[PDB]
Amino acid sequence: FVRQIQLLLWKNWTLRKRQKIRFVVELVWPLSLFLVLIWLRNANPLYSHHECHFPNKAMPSAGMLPWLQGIFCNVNNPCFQSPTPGESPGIVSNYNNSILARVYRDFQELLMNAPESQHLGRIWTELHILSQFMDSWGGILSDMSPRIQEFIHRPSMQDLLWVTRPLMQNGGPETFTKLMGILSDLLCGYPEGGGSRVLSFNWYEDNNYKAFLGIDSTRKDPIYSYDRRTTSFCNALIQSLESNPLTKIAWRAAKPLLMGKILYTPDSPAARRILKNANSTFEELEHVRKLVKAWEEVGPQIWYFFDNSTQMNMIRDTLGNPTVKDFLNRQLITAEAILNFLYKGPRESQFDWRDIFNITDRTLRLVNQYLECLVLDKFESYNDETQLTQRALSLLEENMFWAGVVFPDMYPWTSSLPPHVKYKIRMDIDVVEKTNKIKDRYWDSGPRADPVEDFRYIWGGFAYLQDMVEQGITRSQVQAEAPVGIYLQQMPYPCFVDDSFMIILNRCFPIFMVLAWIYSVSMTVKSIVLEKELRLKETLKNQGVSNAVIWCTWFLDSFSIMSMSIFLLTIFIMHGRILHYSDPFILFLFLLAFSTATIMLCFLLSTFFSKASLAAACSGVIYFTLYLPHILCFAWQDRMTAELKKAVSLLSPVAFGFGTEYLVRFEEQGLGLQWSNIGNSPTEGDEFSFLLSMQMMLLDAAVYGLLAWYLDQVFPGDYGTPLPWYFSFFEREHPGWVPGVCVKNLVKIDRLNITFYENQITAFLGHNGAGKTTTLSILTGLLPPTSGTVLVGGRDIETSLDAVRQSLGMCPQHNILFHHLTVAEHMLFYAQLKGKSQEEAQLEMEAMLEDTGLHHKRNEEAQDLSGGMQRKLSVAIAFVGDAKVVILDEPTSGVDPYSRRSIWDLLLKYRSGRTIIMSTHHMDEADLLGDRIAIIAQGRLYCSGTPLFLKNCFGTGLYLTLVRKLDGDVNELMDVVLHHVPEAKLVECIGQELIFLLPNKNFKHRAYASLFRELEETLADLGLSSFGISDTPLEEIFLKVTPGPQLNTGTQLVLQHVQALLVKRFQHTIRSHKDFLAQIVLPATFVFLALMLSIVIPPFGEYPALTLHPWIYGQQYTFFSMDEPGSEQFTVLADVLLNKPGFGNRCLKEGWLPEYPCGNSTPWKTPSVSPNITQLFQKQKWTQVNPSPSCRCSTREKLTMLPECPEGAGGLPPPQRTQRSTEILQDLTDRNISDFLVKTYPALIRSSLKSKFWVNEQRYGGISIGGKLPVVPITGEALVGFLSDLGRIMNVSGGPITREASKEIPDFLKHLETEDNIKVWFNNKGWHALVSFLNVAHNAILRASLPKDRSPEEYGITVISQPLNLTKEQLSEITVLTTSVDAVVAICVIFSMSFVPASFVLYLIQERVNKSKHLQFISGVSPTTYWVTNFLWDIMNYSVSAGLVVGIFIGFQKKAYTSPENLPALVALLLLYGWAVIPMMYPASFLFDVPSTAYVALSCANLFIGINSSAITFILELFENNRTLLRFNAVLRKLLIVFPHFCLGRGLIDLALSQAVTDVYARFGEEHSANPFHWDLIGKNLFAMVVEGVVYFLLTLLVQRHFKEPIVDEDDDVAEERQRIITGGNKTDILRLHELTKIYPGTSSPAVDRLCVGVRPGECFGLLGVNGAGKTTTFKMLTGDTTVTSGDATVAGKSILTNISEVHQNMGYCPQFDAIDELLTGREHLYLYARLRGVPAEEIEKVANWSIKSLGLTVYADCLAGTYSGGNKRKLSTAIALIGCPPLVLLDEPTTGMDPQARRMLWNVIVSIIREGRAVVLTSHSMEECEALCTRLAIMVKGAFRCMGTIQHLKSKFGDGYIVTMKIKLLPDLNPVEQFFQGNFPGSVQRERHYNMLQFQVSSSSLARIFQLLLSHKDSLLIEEYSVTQTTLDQVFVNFAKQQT
Ligand SMILES: CC(C)CCC[C@@H](C)[C@H]1CC[C@H]2[C@@H]3CC=C4C[C@@H](O)CC[C@]4(C)[C@H]3CC[C@]12C
Ligand SMILES: CC(C)CCC[C@@H](C)[C@H]1CC[C@H]2[C@@H]3CC=C4C[C@@H](O)CC[C@]4(C)[C@H]3CC[C@]12C
Ligand SMILES: *[C@@H]1O[C@H](CO)[C@@H](O)[C@H](O)[C@H]1NC(C)=O
């Protein structure tokens, strides 16, 4: 058994090594694919970021001073790493580190709190007040003098504020960068420089395709109109800012805020009150503007006082201090004197009062001029949403539109606010997040904190407006007890890494690893099915191998070659840095499991098929289709049950995907795939794991293998035996010969007995019906008998079947040769398989190689051997194993006679004790070879004996053959013959030949001897030329045992051709399954799938409204922080936040959304924690810097997506409550919130992160009550009074504006910055969380300030977001995606529609690869009419298919194509595309030569061409650049017209574009009436496509239309024929050749050389040929297939070179290789070829019936011609040849594979045709056929006719003498006869001698002497039986072939 595995393994390895080209691709293809994967890896670096804590962003309810800071210092979202001061429990300022803050802190720390400074100031103020009324001090001032000194001393001014601020003071500072650098430090102190902003890399989200393609199209530039009714200065300013590429996005994003408007619809007095109370910030800013403007007037008064007042007298007195008060000046002077000089001014020098006053003047005038044209009256009224939107578009096109507030509940007469007030905010969609989706689809592992594209509710202007409106509503409904502000504070985020690869390596790795093995699968299945197509599997099984061994060895071979590639690929992956952290061994095992599943899938796939090419073409596609469902099941894994998963894992490719998902997800989180963490579901309770996936793949492999084995063993091909679904006429036998196979008493339901002998080559003869096949089956081990015994040398079949199989060779009818194996390896392998050892096999192989004659091709491929040598090798390998019994089956079936003789020589050399048993159909072979023939018929063994015994037992008399030169008269021949022997019958007379018959009973020897003496002496006197005697041929014995109608021509004949071709095509297509499937099904299903995947995207209108509450995010955790519990208002605020109404609005008393009901709650439980954590926290005293165990980030070589980090992080869990709103609420009161969030978020997301699709983080925000922003201890009244008194002293009166601005100062001061605010933590990874929790906070603020007489469970504020309608550009940008999906649909449609003509080309190739096309061309059909009729049929069929596809399109009701104004365009496009694509692929039928290879190439080419020609032009049209894009696209668009597919692709795409544009203009409301057939849009495609189709057809017709030496010496007959042709050329010679000569190009050796013969009517000029002489060539160019080089071949006078149609109508071909359509019925072929031949229609039945009757075959007449066998096929071809009674009828091997009693019938018909008077021309290898039916043979050796003449004359001159065989009575009696022949006949070779019978070969023409001697000495020689014969014709041809070499 193991020997079988070893042999098959060695053979498979040898074959794989021999192929040598599949091997390289095998090893290279996956390496190239995964090198592409490596390059993808190396061009996608991973983004790693440090911990990220953010500052808080103030809101307009926190006063305009902090809010402004929070909109200038936080335009970048700094993201520091250390926590900001703003996240501390009770601190909100976040800016104690700016220069101003520190300086002011110092200013308090030495001045306000100073013990004596306040007293000194009060004293100075009192003294100043006294002096003004009039109109023991000084020591206090000196005491203050040191205090200001160290106020200067503190290092907030020595360096800071005096090394930074003066930097801009020298000259003009740079405008943009370092001014912001200094101002940021001057206003907000921020550590670590400024911090690094996080970026956003989710381009594919938000559906912003500009970023990926890199398109610099921002937005249309806003319309400019000079007159805004505003000062020209800032009209010029807008001119400047709207032009430069610098500061163009910033101004476009900031103009709405500073200058835009706010439009509110209801206009009711209540809305007016709401938006008057929501107006505070604008009053504040406008008050600041008034103050700045009033300084403009107050200033000149200050200057006038400073130079013109009593202060001049005071300054003069101070200058007089050296004359008055020098002591006081010197006590503390010169610096004061310098200030006094400045007071004096009139000084060129700098650093004086003039300079500081001038700089203050300049800066304040500049600030006033800049501020003077803001817009602080933003509120405009309207009446309904319609006018609001109509004005909103008009404003927005100018880019002055902030937002629009709409109250959906109050009519224009409303006066009292309802409890549940509701409003909506409408804005442009470039300013608000989209309102249809609430979460990013694929979870990026970032914080989503990039200020430009993540935050858009903040810089856009949503949150500010919402805060203003909600504080307005709050202050309107309730009183003003105390105001509290709102700070938004983004939640912190842990330290992440963003690996952009993992998305790619998720989906791509499966499909790449499947494409890696789409070639190996095809090769393996092709090999497996090819081994079974050529019947070698049956041969192997017969010799003894089991069925399991074949499967096991196929598996081992494939597994070895695949394992090599898997090892290479795994090393390549691991050391190419695609996977970073993974045990390579487990990855290798995973790949091996997939390979095993794939190999067993190949085993199963090979079971369905039976062809070779078809399997190789289709198996890879089947493999890919099997993989395909994993793509569908990849976006639905969040709803897919584990039970479903395991069930849908039955496909190995699908299982691969489910494993690589865990591969990538384990590689991403850092640990990677290792042994310990395998088989464990990474997510929580998936129950699906890697190890179980591998086990499922192994189970898949086992199931595939068992199913394949059962299916094959139950459904074998045409060759195996399917299993049930369940599973005196006999020569005396002289005792000398030892019996070899003594089968006796055999029965089967044959009833016979016969004993084959030791050495003699017994021939077995029969009709194949009554035996000779079943008997050979029982004799071998193939099949067991019933009630019989077959004794093979003493080992009965039933009893022993091991030794019998060991010692009985067998050669089947077909040869048994592996490809790619040399003869030596074949012979060694076949010797070993029988059972010898290795060395014995080598010795036997060498010896029998020497005995065979193939030793010179010792190492030559078994494909390069010629057919004769292949058959000889097969017969030789039937002799291996030293088999003492051999059973051939038709040796030398179709080999040329020389190889036939060679195989006979082999058989003679190996008959020494072998008991050969040949079963043959030929009769000469069974006679010249067999030593005893045994015939069986009816099941009876009729006779069996020596061929001499049969020829002399019931054999007819010896016939007589005579030939003349016409020139011999008949009467005298018969006269003399009958006079010598009066019992002679002239049995047959043919031209130039005469055949008699003479009996052998009363043999009358003297008369015979006289007859031959007379015919030899007087040979030439009569008309004779030669004569001979033939003994009864064995074929006769074996058989005995068991004029033309008128033809149409002209124009009716062409109509006959058209009708006949059309009917033939239709009748073939109507009865075929596969054409209909590839013609009606596949296009329909592909179009249907494309359309079904088209409508999956619903049409989009305008963005829907979406109310704003947190519970749109599902189930979540939200916390709070009760801080600063002293204040009663905050206590009741906390109570309202917790218990009374709930968190937001869900449990409102009256009602709320009906989809969100709320129930009861839980009484404030606390989670239970393991004692580990309690002991951990008790054992170590954690400081306040770190309260919880710090947990580790992603270090090097351990990069983790989120930091896995130990238990106990974040501290003990806080008490919880499942609130009424059904949202678990925690309570972080005395507990770091930032630290807790940071070290709790990882585990929280890990517990909820499966598939990373629409993931739900369990916490989205919370509200932290309490935060105290310190405020200055200055009241408004004191400040204004101080300024008023100061102005009173310095003679300052102001005026109107200084009074209108300095009158409302207390409210201005009170609204500046607020106090006791609250924080709103918000997780921004949910898009609408910020505004939602802002709304919740304001609801709480409202509900906490009620007057306690009204229940707080019914008051609330509800915000709704819904954007305006989209304009031109946004609508176009949306419609681009629909255009893209329609383009994909168009590509799929062209692919589906191109599936149709590929079948047409398939049929064309299948018909051309036979001779069917050429045979029709011979019958008389022009090329042009052939192609025209085929084109008409193809057009009609494609019209049917396109009508079906149009119907499918209509079914879907697609408005784009099926509109009544668009349907004609679709119909025309489809029909014309067929019209233009069919002629394009007509020429492709000439290139290929095998269906299932042309189809793949045509489909792939069509798909690729369409994809490129559509996608390239569409994408390039999407662009706008003109360099390398626009002109190149235009020139490319013109070139790509040459492809028909491009044309219809753009047709469909342009129809979609026109429909989209019309849809847009209908939505806004216009009319766009572009009809599709407009030349620019569609109509160039139709014109160009039609012209292209017309050009293609002409090109196809053109391609079909296109692509001396002196006479050497010869014998007498060839030269005589030459002269009979050249001179006195005959008139009646039907076919006359004239120096026909053809030389192959590039060989300089003539294939033929100057043939010259003519054939008379009634002369079967059989034309033989030595192998390679080119008889095929002379036929191929006599018909017309191959062009002629010289000479001319006239037929019935018509030449062949010039006019050929008459020749074709005057001849009838019969190709060697049968050419018939496998679907048309038997009678239909005759119908067809009769119609082409032109016999009229009314009598077609008569001719068809004559032809069907003449050839038998009448019972197979009406049946599909593919169901016939070889004999019936040849009969049909012959009947086709004789269809119209043509004068010349040119056959070529008429009878191959036919059995006697049928071959005779075909020969008879031919003989009758010959006798009618019409010539024929034969060509064959079976020389018995020629000798039977031809009358003028001619042998052609090397391009020339070696010999010509009648059969008898040829075998006279060329042939040797008569062969006389005779037997004596015993074996000793035979010796004496011999020397008698040695005496009288000196020339005597004994050809063969055997026991009791010796056959002399005497080369003596004078046979009369042999006759008279052998009948005078009949007694004395003891001669009982004898026979005289003559050297047959084959001997002559073998002599020729032998002398050739
Ligand atoms: C319009 C004229 C010229 C041509 C019409 C051709 C039509 C009739 C042909 C084209 C494809 C054909 C089908 C192809 C395959 C099959 C499967 C076979 O098991 C039954 C017949 C059936 C179902 C054929 C019915 C006839 C059919 C629909
Ligand atoms: C992906 C696309 C382009 C190709 C699909 C797979 C190709 C290779 C397959 C699918 C259908 C197959 C054909 C189905 C039927 C037949 C008829 C048969 O008498 C010859 C082979 C032939 C013509 C096959 C050739 C190979 C084939 C064309
Ligand atoms: C930070 O801000 C507040 C303001 O008083 C306070 O915590 C502290 O004084 C400031 N300075 C620090 C913490 O250095």
Side-chain angles (χ1 to χ4, degrees), residues 253 379 395 719 738 1220 1354 1568 1648 1706 1853 1891:
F379 294 91
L395 261 183
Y719 304 121
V738 165
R1220 304 221 281 121
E1354 41 196 350
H1568 202 257
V1648 305
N1706 264 347
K1853 182 153 63 83
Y1891 292 111

Side-chain angles (χ1 to χ4, degrees), residues 264-312 320 322 335 337 345-346 351-405:
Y264 73 112
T265 181
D267 203 38
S268 176
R272 184 141 41 241
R273 184 191 321 141
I274 278 174
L275 261 53
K276 174 222 301 173
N277 274 327
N279 194 46
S280 196
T281 311
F282 303 131
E283 301 146 80
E284 212 66 1
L285 271 163
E286 172 285 348
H287 203 137
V288 175
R289 224 181 51 181
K290 204 163 311 303
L291 201 43
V292 165
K293 184 192 321 313
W295 181 98
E296 171 265 310
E297 162 205 350
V298 75
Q301 263 194 290
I302 278 174
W303 190 107
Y304 153 80
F305 153 80
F306 214 80
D307 313 318
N308 283 87
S309 166
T310 181
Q311 63 75 10
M312 211 75 248
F351 185 73
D352 61 356
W353 147 84
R354 179 60 57 169
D355 313 328
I356 188 74
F357 184 70
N358 264 357
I359 188 54
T360 291
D361 213 38
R362 184 211 320 300
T363 181
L364 271 183
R365 304 301 260 281
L366 171 73
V367 175
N368 164 17
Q369 193 154 290
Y370 263 50
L371 271 193
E372 172 205 80
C373 74
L374 261 53
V375 185
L376 311 193
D377 173 317
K378 304 212 171 323
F379 294 91
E380 321 206 350
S381 286
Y382 283 110
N383 284 97
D384 43 9
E385 201 275 357
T386 301
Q387 303 154 80
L388 181 163
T389 291
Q390 183 283 350
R391 184 61 191 310
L393 281 293
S394 166
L395 261 183
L396 181 43
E397 71 176 20
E398 211 166 340
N399 214 17
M400 321 185 178
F401 173 90
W402 190 348
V405 165

Side-chain angles (χ1 to χ4, degrees), residues 85 91 93 95-97 105 1270:
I91 278 174
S93 60
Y95 301 116
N96 63 24
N97 224 27
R105 194 191 311 201

Side-chain angles (χ1 to χ4, degrees), residues 121 136-144:
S136 64
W137 291 95
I140 318 306
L141 324 182
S142 178
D143 299 347
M144 294 300 293

Side-chain angles (χ1 to χ4, degrees), residues 1025-1302:
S1025 86
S1026 46
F1027 68 108
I1029 288 297
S1030 171
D1031 190 308
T1032 291
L1034 172 43
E1035 191 265 10
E1036 291 286 340
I1037 288 284
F1038 164 70
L1039 211 53
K1040 164 172 301 323
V1041 165
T1042 311
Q1046 183 34 250
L1047 271 43
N1048 314 97
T1049 181
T1051 191
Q1052 183 84 30
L1053 182 44
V1054 165
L1055 271 43
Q1056 273 264 330
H1057 292 46
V1058 175
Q1059 173 194 110
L1061 281 293
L1062 271 173
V1063 175
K1064 154 212 161 183
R1065 194 71 141 71
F1066 164 46
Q1067 203 144 10
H1068 163 96
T1069 191
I1070 178 174
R1071 194 201 320 310
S1072 86
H1073 283 157
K1074 304 162 31 173
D1075 293 28
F1076 154 80
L1077 171 153
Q1079 263 193 39
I1080 308 314
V1081 165
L1082 291 203
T1085 81
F1086 264 70
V1087 165
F1088 184 110
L1089 261 53
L1091 301 203
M1092 211 75 208
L1093 261 53
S1094 166
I1095 78 174
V1096 75
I1097 308 314
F1100 164 60
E1102 191 295 309
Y1103 283 130
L1106 172 143
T1107 191
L1108 282 193
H1109 53 307
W1111 300 278
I1112 78 184
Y1113 284 109
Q1115 163 54 240
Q1116 43 174 50
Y1117 294 60
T1118 71
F1119 64 81
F1120 84 86
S1121 166
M1122 181 45 257
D1123 193 8
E1124 162 206 339
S1127 196
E1128 61 285 40
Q1129 153 194 20
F1130 273 140
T1131 291
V1132 75
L1133 172 43
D1135 173 315
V1136 165
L1137 211 53
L1138 291 203
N1139 304 7
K1140 274 272 151 283
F1143 214 80
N1145 264 287
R1146 194 181 201 210
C1147 314
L1148 201 73
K1149 164 162 291 183
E1150 51 206 90
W1152 181 238
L1153 277 296
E1155 321 166 40
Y1156 304 101
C1158 85
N1160 44 7
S1161 56
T1162 291
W1164 210 248
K1165 74 152 291 183
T1166 181
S1168 306
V1169 55
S1170 166
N1172 283 76
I1173 298 85
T1174 311
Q1175 173 293 339
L1176 161 53
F1177 273 128
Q1178 83 74 20
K1179 299 296 183 181
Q1180 316 185 28
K1181 314 312 151 273
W1182 310 88
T1183 58
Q1184 193 44 290
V1185 165
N1186 73 326
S1188 286
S1190 56
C1191 85
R1192 54 201 41 81
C1193 274
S1194 76
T1195 181
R1196 184 41 31 71
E1197 61 293 349
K1198 185 52 171 323
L1199 281 83
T1200 51
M1201 181 205 48
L1202 291 173
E1204 71 255 10
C1205 84
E1207 51 76 20
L1212 271 43
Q1216 323 194 350
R1217 174 221 290 261
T1218 291
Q1219 213 154 10
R1220 304 221 281 121
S1221 306
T1222 292
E1223 61 156 30
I1224 298 85
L1225 171 153
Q1226 283 134 30
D1227 173 327
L1228 321 173
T1229 312
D1230 302 358
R1231 278 181 48 82
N1232 224 306
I1233 278 174
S1234 46
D1235 163 78
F1236 173 60
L1237 301 203
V1238 165
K1239 314 163 151 33
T1240 291
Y1241 174 80
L1244 191 83
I1245 208 64
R1246 254 201 271 281
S1247 166
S1248 166
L1249 181 73
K1250 64 202 321 193
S1251 46
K1252 314 182 51 173
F1253 274 100
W1254 300 98
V1255 55
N1256 184 347
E1257 321 86 350
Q1258 273 84 330
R1259 64 161 51 110
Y1260 274 111
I1263 278 174
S1264 166
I1265 318 164
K1268 174 172 301 323
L1269 171 43
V1271 295
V1272 285
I1274 308 314
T1275 181
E1277 171 46 0
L1279 172 43
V1280 55
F1282 174 80
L1283 271 293
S1284 166
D1285 293 18
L1286 192 173
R1288 164 201 71 161
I1289 308 314
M1290 331 315 288
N1291 165 286
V1292 165
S1293 86
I1297 178 174
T1298 81
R1299 274 311 191 211
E1300 81 176 70
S1302 176

Side-chain angles (χ1 to χ4, degrees), residues 683-954:
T683 181
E684 181 146 50
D686 213 358
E687 182 36 33
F688 204 51
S689 46
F690 203 51
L691 171 153
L692 172 153
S693 166
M694 291 195 328
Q695 283 164 340
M696 191 75 38
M697 201 145 48
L698 261 63
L699 161 73
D700 263 8
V703 165
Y704 284 134
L706 277 296
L707 191 53
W709 160 97
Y710 154 80
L711 211 53
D712 173 88
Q713 203 144 10
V714 165
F715 283 40
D718 313 278
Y719 304 121
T721 61
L723 271 73
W725 300 58
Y726 324 119
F727 194 10
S728 166
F729 284 161
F730 304 72
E731 171 146 30
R732 64 211 181 310
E733 321 206 350
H734 163 286
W737 320 288
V738 165
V741 175
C742 54
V743 54
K744 74 212 171 313
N745 274 357
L746 191 143
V747 165
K748 184 43 161 313
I749 188 54
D750 43 358
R751 184 41 210 151
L752 71 83
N753 43 27
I754 178 164
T755 292
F756 304 73
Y757 284 168
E758 182 46 90
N759 314 67
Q760 313 174 330
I761 318 174
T762 291
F764 214 80
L765 272 193
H767 262 117
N768 204 347
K772 184 202 91 73
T773 311
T774 81
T775 301
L776 291 193
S777 306
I778 317 164
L779 281 153
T780 51
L782 211 63
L783 181 163
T786 81
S787 46
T789 181
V790 166
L791 202 43
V792 165
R795 264 81 61 71
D796 174 338
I797 288 284
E798 291 76 0
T799 81
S800 296
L801 202 43
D802 163 12
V804 185
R805 254 191 181 81
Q806 203 154 80
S807 86
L808 172 153
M810 171 155 208
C811 164
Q813 193 293 339
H814 53 67
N815 44 17
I816 47 184
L817 301 193
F818 293 118
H819 302 347
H820 312 287
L821 271 193
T822 52
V823 305
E825 311 156 310
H826 272 107
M827 274 174 139
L828 261 183
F829 164 50
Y830 274 110
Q832 273 154 320
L833 202 163
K834 264 192 191 43
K836 284 163 191 133
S837 166
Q838 203 303 329
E839 61 295 340
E840 291 166 300
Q842 183 54 330
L843 271 53
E844 181 285 347
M845 181 275 258
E846 191 46 287
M848 161 265 288
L849 211 63
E850 181 36 33
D851 293 338
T852 291
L854 301 153
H855 172 247
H856 62 67
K857 314 193 181 33
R858 194 201 221 271
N859 63 17
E860 172 96 10
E861 281 215 80
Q863 313 144 240
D864 293 328
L865 271 43
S866 46
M869 271 185 268
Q870 303 204 80
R871 194 51 151 131
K872 164 172 211 213
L873 171 63
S874 166
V875 175
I877 78 184
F879 264 110
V880 305
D882 263 8
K884 254 42 191 173
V885 175
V886 185
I887 278 174
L888 311 193
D889 173 316
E890 182 96 350
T892 81
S893 66
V895 305
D896 43 358
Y898 184 50
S899 306
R900 204 150 71 61
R901 295 298 162 156
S902 166
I903 288 154
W904 290 8
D905 183 318
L906 191 43
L907 282 193
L908 281 293
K909 194 162 321 193
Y910 278 129
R911 46 173 292 185
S912 297
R914 284 281 211 300
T915 292
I916 318 184
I917 308 194
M918 51 175 38
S919 176
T920 181
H921 272 317
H922 302 197
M923 302 325 317
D924 63 38
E925 161 185 59
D927 164 8
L928 321 183
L929 201 43
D931 293 8
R932 54 201 291 291
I933 48 184
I935 308 144
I936 68 184
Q938 173 254 330
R940 274 301 161 271
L941 171 83
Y942 204 110
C943 74
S944 86
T946 312
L948 171 143
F949 174 110
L950 301 203
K951 274 142 81 163
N952 264 27
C953 165
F954 44 100

Side-chain angles (χ1 to χ4, degrees), residues 448 566 623 701 979 1006 1045 1092 1208 1240 1280 1586 1589 1650 1687 1900:
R448 174 201 220 280
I566 288 184
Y623 194 40
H979 153 86
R1006 303 320 81 211
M1092 211 75 208
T1240 291
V1280 55
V1586 156
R1650 184 161 30 250
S1900 66

